[PDB]
PDB file of C-alpha atoms in Angstrom:
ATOM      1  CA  UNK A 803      16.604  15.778   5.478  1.00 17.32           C
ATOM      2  CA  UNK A 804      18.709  14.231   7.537  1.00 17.84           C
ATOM      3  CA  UNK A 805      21.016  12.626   4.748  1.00 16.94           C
ATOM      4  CA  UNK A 806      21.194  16.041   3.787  1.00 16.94           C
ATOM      5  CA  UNK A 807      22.739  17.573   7.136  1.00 16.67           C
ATOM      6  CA  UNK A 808      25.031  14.259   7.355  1.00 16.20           C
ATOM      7  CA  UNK A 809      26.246  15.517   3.623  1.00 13.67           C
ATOM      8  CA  UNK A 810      26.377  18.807   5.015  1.00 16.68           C
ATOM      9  CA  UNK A 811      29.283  17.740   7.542  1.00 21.18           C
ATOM     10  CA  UNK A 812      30.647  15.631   4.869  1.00 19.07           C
ATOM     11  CA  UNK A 813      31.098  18.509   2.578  1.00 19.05           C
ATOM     12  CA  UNK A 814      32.695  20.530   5.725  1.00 14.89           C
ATOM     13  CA  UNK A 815      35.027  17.988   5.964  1.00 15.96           C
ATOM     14  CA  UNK A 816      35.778  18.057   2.087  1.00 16.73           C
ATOM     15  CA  UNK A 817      35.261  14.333   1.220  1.00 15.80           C
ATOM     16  CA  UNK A 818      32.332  13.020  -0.881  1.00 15.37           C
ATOM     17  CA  UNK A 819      28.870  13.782   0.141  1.00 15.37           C
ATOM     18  CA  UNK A 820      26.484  10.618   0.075  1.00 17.05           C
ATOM     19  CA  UNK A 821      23.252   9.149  -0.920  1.00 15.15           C
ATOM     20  CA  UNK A 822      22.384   5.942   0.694  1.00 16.93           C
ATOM     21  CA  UNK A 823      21.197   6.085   4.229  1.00 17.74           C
ATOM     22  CA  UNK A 824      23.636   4.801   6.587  1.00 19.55           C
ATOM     23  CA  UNK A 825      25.044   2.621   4.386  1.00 15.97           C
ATOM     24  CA  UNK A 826      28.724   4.054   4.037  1.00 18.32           C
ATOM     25  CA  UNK A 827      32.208   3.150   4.693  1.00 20.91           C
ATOM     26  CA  UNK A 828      33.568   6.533   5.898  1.00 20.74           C
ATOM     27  CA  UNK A 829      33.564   7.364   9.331  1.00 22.01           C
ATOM     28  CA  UNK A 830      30.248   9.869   9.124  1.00 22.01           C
ATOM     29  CA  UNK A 831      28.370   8.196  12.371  1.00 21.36           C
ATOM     30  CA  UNK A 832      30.185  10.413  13.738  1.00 22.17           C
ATOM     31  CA  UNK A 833      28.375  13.100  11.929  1.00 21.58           C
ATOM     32  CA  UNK A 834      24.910  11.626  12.975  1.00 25.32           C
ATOM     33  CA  UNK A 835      26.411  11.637  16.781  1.00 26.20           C
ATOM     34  CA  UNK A 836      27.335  14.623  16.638  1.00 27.08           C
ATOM     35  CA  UNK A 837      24.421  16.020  14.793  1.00 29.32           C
ATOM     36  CA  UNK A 838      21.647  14.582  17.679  1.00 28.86           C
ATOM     37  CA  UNK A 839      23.777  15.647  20.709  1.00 29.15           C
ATOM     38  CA  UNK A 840      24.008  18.868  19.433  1.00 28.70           C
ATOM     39  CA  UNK A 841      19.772  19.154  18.750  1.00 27.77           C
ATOM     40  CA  UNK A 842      19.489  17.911  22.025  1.00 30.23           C
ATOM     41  CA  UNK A 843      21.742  20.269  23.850  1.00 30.89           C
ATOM     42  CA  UNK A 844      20.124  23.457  21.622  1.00 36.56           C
ATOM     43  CA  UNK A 845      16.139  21.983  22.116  1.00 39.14           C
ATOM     44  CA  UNK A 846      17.066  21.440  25.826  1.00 40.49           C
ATOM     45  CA  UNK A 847      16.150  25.413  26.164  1.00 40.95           C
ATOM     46  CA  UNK A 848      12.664  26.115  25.766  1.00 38.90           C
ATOM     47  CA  UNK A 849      11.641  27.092  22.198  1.00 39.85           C
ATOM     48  CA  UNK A 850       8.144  28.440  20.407  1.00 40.54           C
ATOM     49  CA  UNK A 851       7.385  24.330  19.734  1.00 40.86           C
ATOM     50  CA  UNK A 852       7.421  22.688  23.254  1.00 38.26           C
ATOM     51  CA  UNK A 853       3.973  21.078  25.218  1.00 39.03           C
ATOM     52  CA  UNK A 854       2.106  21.671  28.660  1.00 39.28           C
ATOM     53  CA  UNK A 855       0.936  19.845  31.221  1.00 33.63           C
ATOM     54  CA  UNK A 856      -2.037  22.267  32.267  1.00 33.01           C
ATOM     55  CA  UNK A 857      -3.386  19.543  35.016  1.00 34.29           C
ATOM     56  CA  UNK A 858      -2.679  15.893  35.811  1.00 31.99           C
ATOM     57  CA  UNK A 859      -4.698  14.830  38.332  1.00 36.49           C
ATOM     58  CA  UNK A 860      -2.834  11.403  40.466  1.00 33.88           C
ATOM     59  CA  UNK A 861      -4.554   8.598  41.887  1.00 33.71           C
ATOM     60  CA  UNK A 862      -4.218   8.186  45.232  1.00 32.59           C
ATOM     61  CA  UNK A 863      -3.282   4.575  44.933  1.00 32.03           C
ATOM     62  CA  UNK A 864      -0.017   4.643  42.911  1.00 30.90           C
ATOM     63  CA  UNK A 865       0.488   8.225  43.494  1.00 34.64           C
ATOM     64  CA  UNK A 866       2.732   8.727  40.787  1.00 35.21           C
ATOM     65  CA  UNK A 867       2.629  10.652  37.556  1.00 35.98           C
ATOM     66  CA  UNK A 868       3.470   9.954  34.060  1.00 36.82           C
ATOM     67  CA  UNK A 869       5.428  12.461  31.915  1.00 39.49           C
ATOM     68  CA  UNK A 870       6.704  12.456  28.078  1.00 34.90           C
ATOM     69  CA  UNK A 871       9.046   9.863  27.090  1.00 36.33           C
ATOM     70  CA  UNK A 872      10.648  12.569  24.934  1.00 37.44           C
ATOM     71  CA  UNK A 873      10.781  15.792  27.352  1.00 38.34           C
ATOM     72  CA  UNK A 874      13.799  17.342  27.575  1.00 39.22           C
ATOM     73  CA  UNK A 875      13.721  20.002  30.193  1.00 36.07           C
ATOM     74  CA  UNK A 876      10.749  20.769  32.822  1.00 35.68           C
ATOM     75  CA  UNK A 877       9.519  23.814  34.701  1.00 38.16           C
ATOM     76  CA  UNK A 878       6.720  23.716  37.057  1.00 39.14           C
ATOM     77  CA  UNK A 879       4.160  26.627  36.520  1.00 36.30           C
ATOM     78  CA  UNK A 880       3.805  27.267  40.029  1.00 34.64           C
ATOM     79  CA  UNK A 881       7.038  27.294  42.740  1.00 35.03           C
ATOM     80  CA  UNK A 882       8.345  23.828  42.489  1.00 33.60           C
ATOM     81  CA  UNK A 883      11.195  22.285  41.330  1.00 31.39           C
ATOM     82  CA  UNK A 884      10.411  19.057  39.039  1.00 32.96           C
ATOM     83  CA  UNK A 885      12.624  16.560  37.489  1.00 33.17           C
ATOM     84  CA  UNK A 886      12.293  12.902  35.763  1.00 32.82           C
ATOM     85  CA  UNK A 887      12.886   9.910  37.819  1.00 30.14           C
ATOM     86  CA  UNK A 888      12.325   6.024  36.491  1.00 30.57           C
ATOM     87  CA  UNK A 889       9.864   8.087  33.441  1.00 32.47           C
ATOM     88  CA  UNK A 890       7.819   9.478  36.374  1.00 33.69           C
ATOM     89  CA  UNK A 891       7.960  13.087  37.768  1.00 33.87           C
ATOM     90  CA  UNK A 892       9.800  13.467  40.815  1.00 35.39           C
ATOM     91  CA  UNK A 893      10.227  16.427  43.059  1.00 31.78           C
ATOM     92  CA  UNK A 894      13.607  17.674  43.629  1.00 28.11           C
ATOM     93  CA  UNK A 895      13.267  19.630  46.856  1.00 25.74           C
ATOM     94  CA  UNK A 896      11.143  16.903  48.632  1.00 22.20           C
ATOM     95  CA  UNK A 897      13.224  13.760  47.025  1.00 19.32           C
ATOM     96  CA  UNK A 898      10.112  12.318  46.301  1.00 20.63           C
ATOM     97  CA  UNK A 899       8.154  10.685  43.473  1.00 21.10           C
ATOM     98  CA  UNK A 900       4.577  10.525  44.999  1.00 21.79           C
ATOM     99  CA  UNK A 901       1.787  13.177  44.938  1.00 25.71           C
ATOM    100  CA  UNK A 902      -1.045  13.831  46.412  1.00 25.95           C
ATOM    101  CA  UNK A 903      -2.417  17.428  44.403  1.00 24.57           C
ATOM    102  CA  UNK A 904      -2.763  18.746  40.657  1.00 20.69           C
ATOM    103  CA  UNK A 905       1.051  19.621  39.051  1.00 21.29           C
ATOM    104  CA  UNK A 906       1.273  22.454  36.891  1.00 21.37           C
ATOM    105  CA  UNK A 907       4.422  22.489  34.680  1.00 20.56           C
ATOM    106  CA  UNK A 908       5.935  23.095  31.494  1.00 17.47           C
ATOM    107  CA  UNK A 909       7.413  20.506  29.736  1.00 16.62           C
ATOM    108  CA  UNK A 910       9.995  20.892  26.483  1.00 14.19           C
ATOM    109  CA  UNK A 911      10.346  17.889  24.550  1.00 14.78           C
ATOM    110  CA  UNK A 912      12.727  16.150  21.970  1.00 13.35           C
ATOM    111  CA  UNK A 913      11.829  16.426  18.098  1.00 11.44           C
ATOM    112  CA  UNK A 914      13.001  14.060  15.137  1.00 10.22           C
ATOM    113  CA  UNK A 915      15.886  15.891  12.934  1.00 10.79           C
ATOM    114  CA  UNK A 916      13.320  15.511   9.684  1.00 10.49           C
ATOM    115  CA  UNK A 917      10.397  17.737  11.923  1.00 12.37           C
ATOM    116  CA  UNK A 918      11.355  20.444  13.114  1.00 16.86           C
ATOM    117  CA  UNK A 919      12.141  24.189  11.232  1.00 17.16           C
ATOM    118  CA  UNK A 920      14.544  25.083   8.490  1.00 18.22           C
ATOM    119  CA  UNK A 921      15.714  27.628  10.660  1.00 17.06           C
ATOM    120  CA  UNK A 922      16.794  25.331  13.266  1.00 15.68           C
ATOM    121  CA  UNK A 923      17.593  22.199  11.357  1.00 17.09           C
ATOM    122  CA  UNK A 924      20.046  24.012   9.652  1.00 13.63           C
ATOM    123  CA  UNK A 925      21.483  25.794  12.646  1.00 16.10           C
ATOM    124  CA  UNK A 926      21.739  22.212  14.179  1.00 13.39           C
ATOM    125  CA  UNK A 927      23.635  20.796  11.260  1.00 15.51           C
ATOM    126  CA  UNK A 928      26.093  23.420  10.892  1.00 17.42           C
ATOM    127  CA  UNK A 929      26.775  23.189  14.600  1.00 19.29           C
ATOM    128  CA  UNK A 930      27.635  19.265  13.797  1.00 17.33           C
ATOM    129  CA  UNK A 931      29.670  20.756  10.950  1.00 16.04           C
ATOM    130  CA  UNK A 932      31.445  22.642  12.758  1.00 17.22           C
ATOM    131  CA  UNK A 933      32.163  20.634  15.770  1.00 15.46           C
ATOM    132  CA  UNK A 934      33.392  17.648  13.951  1.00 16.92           C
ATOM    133  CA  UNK A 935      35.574  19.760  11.734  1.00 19.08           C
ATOM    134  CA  UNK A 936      37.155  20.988  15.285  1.00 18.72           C
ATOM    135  CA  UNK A 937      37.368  17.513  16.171  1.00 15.72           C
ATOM    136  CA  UNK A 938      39.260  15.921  12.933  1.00 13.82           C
ATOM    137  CA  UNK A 939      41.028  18.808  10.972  1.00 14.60           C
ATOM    138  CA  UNK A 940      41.770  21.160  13.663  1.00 15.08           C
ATOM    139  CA  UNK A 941      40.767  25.013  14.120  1.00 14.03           C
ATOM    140  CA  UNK A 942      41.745  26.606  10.947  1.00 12.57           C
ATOM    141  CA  UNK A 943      39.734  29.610   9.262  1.00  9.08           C
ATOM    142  CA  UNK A 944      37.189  27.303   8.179  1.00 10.16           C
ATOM    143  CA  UNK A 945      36.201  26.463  11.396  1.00  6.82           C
ATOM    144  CA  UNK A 946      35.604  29.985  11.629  1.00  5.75           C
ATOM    145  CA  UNK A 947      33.734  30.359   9.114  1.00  7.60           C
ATOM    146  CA  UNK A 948      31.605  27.173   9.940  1.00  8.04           C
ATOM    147  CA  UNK A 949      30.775  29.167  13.422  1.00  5.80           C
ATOM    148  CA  UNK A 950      29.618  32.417  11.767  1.00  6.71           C
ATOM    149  CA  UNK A 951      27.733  30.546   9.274  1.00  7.69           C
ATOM    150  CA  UNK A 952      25.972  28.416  12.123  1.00  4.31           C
ATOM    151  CA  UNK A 953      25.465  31.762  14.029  1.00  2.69           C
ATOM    152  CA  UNK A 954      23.352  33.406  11.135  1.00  4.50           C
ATOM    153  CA  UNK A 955      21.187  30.633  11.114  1.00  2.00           C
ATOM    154  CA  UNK A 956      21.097  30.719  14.832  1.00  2.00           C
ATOM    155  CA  UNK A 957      20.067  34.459  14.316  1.00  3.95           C
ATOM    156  CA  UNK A 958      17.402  33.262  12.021  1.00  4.60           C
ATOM    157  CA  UNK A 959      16.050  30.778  14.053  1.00  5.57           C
ATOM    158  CA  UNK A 960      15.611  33.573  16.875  1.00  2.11           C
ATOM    159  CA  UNK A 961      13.680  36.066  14.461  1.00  2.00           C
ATOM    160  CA  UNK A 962      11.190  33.097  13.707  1.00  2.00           C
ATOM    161  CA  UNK A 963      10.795  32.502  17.150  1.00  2.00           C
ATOM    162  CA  UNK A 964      10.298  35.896  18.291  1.00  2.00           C
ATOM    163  CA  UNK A 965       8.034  36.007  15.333  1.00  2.00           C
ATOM    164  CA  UNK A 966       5.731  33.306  16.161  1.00  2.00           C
ATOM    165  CA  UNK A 967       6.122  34.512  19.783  1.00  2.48           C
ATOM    166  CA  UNK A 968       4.309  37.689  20.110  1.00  4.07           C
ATOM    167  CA  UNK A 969       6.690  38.952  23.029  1.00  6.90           C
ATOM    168  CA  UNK A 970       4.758  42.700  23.102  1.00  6.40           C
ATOM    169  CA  UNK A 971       4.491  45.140  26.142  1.00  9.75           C
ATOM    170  CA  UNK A 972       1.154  43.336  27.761  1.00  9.02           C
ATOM    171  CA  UNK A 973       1.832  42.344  30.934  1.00  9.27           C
ATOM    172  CA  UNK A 974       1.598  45.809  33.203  1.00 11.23           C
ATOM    173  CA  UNK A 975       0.011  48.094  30.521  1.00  9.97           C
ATOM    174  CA  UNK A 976      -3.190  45.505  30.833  1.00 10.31           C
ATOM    175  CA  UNK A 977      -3.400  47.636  34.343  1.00 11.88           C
ATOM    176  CA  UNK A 978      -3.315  50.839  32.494  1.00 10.22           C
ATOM    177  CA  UNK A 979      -5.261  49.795  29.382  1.00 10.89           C
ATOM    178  CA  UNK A 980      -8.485  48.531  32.136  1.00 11.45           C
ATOM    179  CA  UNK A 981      -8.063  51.932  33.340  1.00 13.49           C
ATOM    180  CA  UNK A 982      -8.804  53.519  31.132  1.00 12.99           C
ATOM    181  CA  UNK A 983     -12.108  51.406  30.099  1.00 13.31           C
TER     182      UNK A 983
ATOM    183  CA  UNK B  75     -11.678  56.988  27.585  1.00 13.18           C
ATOM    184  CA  UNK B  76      -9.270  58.581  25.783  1.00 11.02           C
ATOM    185  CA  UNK B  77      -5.784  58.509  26.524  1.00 16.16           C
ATOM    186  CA  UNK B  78      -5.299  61.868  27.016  1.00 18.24           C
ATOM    187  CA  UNK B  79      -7.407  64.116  30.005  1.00 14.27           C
ATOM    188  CA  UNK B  80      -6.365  67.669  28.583  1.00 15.45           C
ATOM    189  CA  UNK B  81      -9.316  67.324  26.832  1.00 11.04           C
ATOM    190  CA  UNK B  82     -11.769  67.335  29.215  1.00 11.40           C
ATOM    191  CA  UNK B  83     -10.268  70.299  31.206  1.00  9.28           C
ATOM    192  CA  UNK B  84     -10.405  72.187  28.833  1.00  8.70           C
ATOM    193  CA  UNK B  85     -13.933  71.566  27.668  1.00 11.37           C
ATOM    194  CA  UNK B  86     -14.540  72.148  31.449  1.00 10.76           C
ATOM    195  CA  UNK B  87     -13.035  75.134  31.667  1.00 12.44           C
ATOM    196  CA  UNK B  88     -14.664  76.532  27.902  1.00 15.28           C
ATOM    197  CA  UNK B  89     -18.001  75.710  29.161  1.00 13.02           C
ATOM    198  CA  UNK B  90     -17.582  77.740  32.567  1.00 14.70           C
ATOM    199  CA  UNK B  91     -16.317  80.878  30.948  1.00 15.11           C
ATOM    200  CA  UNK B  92     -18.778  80.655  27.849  1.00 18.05           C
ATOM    201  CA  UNK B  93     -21.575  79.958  30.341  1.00 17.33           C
ATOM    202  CA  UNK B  94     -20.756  83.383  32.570  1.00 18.00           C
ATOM    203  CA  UNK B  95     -19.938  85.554  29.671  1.00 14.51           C
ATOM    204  CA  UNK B  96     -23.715  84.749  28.051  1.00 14.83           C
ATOM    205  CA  UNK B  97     -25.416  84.704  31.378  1.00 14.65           C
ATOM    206  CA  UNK B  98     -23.172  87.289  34.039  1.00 16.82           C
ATOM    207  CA  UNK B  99     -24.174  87.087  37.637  1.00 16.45           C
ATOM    208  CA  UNK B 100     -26.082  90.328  39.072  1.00 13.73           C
ATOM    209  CA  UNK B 101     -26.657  91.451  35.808  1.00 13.35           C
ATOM    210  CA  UNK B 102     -29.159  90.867  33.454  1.00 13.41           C
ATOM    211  CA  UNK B 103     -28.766  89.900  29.632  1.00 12.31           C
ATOM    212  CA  UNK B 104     -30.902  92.083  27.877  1.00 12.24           C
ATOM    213  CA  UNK B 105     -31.643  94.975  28.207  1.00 13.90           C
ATOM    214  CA  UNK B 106     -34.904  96.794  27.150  1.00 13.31           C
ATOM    215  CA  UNK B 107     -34.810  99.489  24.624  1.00 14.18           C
ATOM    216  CA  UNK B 108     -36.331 103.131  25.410  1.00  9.79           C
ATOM    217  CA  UNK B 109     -39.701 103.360  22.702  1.00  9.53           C
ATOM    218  CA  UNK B 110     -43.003 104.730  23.626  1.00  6.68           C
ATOM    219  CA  UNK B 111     -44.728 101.215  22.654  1.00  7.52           C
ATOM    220  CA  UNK B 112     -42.537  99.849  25.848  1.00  7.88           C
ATOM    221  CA  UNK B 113     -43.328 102.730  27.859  1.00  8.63           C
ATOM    222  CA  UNK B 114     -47.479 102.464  27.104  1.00  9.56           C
ATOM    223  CA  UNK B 115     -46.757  98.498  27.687  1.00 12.87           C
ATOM    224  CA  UNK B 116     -44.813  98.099  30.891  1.00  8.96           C
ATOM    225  CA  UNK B 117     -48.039 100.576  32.950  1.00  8.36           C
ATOM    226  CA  UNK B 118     -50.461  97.533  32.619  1.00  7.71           C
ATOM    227  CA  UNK B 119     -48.076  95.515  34.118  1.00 11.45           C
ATOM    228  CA  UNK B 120     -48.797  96.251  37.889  1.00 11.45           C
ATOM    229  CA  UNK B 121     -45.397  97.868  39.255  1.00  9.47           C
ATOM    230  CA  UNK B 122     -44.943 100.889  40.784  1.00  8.68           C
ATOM    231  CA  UNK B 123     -42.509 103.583  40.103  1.00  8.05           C
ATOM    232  CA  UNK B 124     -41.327 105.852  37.541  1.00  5.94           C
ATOM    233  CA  UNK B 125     -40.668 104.038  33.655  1.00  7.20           C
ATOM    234  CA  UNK B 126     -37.476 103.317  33.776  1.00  6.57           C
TER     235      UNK B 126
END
């Protein structure tokens, strides 16, 4: 899938799309650059697929605490601020990286370009598209077009996660709905 | 419980008025009517006073 988003910028572009992986003269790293900064930068916000940390219990002897090589953005459940230091967590507001209690948080990680959804994969790579056809052949209608074409599938990709996200009216009416039982 | 308490007022309120209208206050519900097998029955009945 991922030769296919790098062919997807090449086509942008207008030169030859092709079929070996990462085996070509022409200058489409730049493509695959382009292509994971930009997946980063959009899975940095938390999305539908992204993991928890319910409870993680430290030794007292370290005192540290382990978090995902591949997280991406953090958010303690409770009201602390928590960041990565040295692949550890760290605590912003105290500037330290020991603890002595259970953390809380939510955690959004980093995922390959060939597992993740259509919706989103595509939305990435037309977002590379466009950007590198800003970068080399200037803003022209096309680029345009590129940006309306990666916000449809940036529209999709919110209807899918709103869809797997059931984000009802249950949060007060649970007060009214006891209530009444 | 249903959502809606109209309901149940006005149940209420049915059942109150039905209630008085079959069974008034200070006045009874049936009333006896005037045959001479009454009037030979009520005599033997131990109350005093004219038949009526």
């Amino acid at each position: 899938r991922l030769t296919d988003a790098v062919n997807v910028t090449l086509e942008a572009l207008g030169e030859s799309r092709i079929v070996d992986i990462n085996t070509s003269n022409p200058s489409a790293g730049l493509a695959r650059a382009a292509l994971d900064r930009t997946r980063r930068g959009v899975l940095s916000t938390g999305w539908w697929f992204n993991t928890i940390i319910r409870e993680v219990t430290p030794t007292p002897n370290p005192g540290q605490i382990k978090v995902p090589w591949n997280q991406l953005s953090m958010y303690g459940l409770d009201g602390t601020k928590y960041g990565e230091r040295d692949g550890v967590l760290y605590n912003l507001v105290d500037q330290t990286k020991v603890f002595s209690d259970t953390v809380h948080l939510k955690v959004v990680i980093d995922i390959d370009f060939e597992d993740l959804p259509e919706h989103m994969a595509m939305w990435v790579a037309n977002a590379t598209a466009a950007q590198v056809y800003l970068n080399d052949l200037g803003a022209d209608g096309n680029y345009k077009s590129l940006l309306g074409i990666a916000a449809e599938y940036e529209a999709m990709n919110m209807r899918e996660h709103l869809r797997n996200q059931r984000y009802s009216t249950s949060r007060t009416h649970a007060a009214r709905k006891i209530r009444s039982g | 419980r249903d959502y809606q308490s109209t309901g149940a007022v006005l149940v209420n309120s049915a059942s109150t008025k039905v209630t008085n209208a079959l069974f008034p206050q200070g006045a009874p519900f049936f009333r006896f009517v005037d045959s001479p097998d009454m009037a030979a029955a009520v005599a033997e009945l131990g109350i005093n006073g004219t038949v009526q």
